[PDB]
């Protein structure tokens, strides 16, 4: 397996990946099969994938693969919940109770880790919940005063707004920081050709703000991604 490291400059995958994380990615592999007598690397649903931005292939993006080839994906912008129908059958999708997250967003915008007992001026506390897609559980953040404007979505020819059917060999990507993520909702599907790898680990983390320099080290974050 071939490996590549990446810095996380933005907040689009909070709380799973933070600004200032450094991650290791495992590149996807074409299988090496002996037809006389490895397996081909594909995203599984829920995988954190690095990929080349389709519209400008010189930029690397990192999102979660929530939609696989054939998936009918529907997003309800009010509840901020996905529905997924594979091979279009309904994928089991569950959501936990909303609770206050560790983060406040100021509003460009910055994010701050603020303890749940405190408050911060010019800020909104982000909510957190668990999203389960099939067999994979991960956290998402939502901004309680935010809601997508569906008229601004990438609209797939043939489809109502806020519903997409993933073409063969393509993926529907979404960020865990659901109100702060420019993802497939807005710029459409990601082709197979554009995938780089799957995020496997945080190998280093620096405590910093989006444009600022590091305030410290978050060694507690080194390890698996969950």
């Amino acid at each position: 397996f071939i490996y590549e490291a990446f810095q996380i400059p933005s907040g689009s995958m909070m709380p799973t990946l933070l600004i200032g994380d450094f991650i290791l990615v495992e590149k996807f592999a074409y299988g090496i099969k002996d037809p006389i007598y490895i397996e081909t690397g594909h995203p599984k649903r829920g995988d954190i994938v690095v990929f080349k931005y389709p519209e400008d292939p010189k930029l690397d993006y990192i999102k979660r693969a929530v939609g696989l080839p054939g998936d009918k994906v529907t997003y309800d912008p009010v509840s901020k919940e996905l529905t997924i129908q594979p091979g279009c059958n309904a994928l089991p999708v569950t959501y936990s109770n909303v609770e206050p997250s560790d983060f406040v967003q100021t509003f460009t915008s910055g994010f701050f880790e603020v303890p749940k007992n405190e408050t911060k001026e010019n800020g909104i506390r982000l909510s957190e919940r668990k999203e389960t897609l099939g067999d994979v559980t991960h956290r998402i953040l939502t901004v309680p005063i935010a809601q997508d404007q569906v008229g601004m979505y990438y609209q797939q020819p043939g489809q109502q707004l806020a519903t997409w059917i993933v073409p063969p060999g393509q993926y529907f990507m979404m960020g865990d920081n659901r109100d702060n993520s420019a993802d497939s909702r807005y710029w459409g599907f990601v082709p197979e050709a554009n995938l780089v790898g799957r995020a496997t680990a945080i190998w280093m983390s620096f405590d910093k703000q989006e444009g600022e320099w590091p305030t410290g080290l978050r060694l507690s974050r080194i390890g698996g991604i969950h």
């Binding site: 990446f6 810095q7 996380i8 933005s10 689009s12 990615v25 690095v50 931005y53 690397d60 990192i62």
Partner: peptide, 6 residues
């Protein structure tokens, strides 16, 4: 690498 992912 060491490059960024947005």
């Amino acid at each position: 690498x060491x490059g960024g992912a947005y």
